[PDB]
């Protein structure tokens, strides 16, 4: 029925992102309290999406 008609839509789509830069990229702690020995833990990165 709509061979030569126009069609328009209002649509919902899932949010999506890509990492375009990594910022304040690494933060660190030698956690030692209440451990058998010194341990290295990487704290949260910040991403610019």
């Amino acid at each position: 029925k709509y061979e030569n008609h126009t069609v328009t839509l209002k649509i919902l789509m899932t949010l999506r992102y890509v990492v375009s830069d990594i910022l304040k990229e690494s933060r660190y702690q030698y956690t030692k309290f209440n451990q058998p020995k010194s341990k290295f833990e990487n704290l949260p990165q910040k991403l610019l999406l």
């Binding site: 309290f33 209440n34 451990q35 058998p36």
Partner: protein, 50 residues
């Protein structure tokens, strides 16, 4: 004792060593001694030559 401290665990922060039962028994023995003085009582079965 641990049951009354449910959810609390005690360790040496420099190591992974929690205190063993030896300390608890030792503490409990002196605790039952202290209660034995707190009322003028004998609190464990014990023979007496009087």
């Amino acid at each position: 004792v641990k049951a009354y401290m449910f959810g609390i665990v005690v360790q040496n922060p420099d190591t992974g060593q929690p205190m063993g039962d030896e300390f608890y028994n030792h503490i409990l023995e002196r605790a039952v001694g202290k209660a034995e003085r707190a009322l003028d009582i004998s609190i464990l079965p014990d023979t007496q030559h009087e």
